[PDB]
């Protein structure tokens, strides 16, 4: 059998929930249960909570939003490969 090169790698697909809403001051749960590299597996999990907290490696993060407003949570994934895909979801936090 041939060295497949690279190039071939399928990258992850990222399965992210993010709820719509959530409430000030209280906990929020994010899910990327069910991301999968088609040709792998998944090596890492990075999310950015769209607030300026730490980035967070976890799949399935909790975190609370100590301000009323709405953010852009980025995910990002990476494969056994070293390559990586992302998405984004917005919430709005509200009391
Ligand atoms: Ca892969």
């Known amino acids: 059998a041939e060295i497949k090169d690279l190039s071939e790698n399928k990258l992850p697909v990222i399965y992210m929930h993010v709820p719509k809403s959530g409430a000030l001051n209280q906990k929020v749960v994010f899910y990327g249960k069910g991301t999968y590299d088609p040709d792998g597996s998944i090596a890492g999990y990075q ?4 607030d300026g907290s730490d980035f967070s490696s976890e799949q399935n993060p909790s975190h609370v939003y100590t301000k009323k407003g709405e953010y852009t949570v980025t995910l990002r994934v990476m ?16 009391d």
């Open 47 to 50: 999310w950015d909570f769209g």
């Open 79 to 94: 494969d056994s490969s070293g390559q990586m895909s992302e998405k984004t979801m917005k919430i709005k936090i509200t």
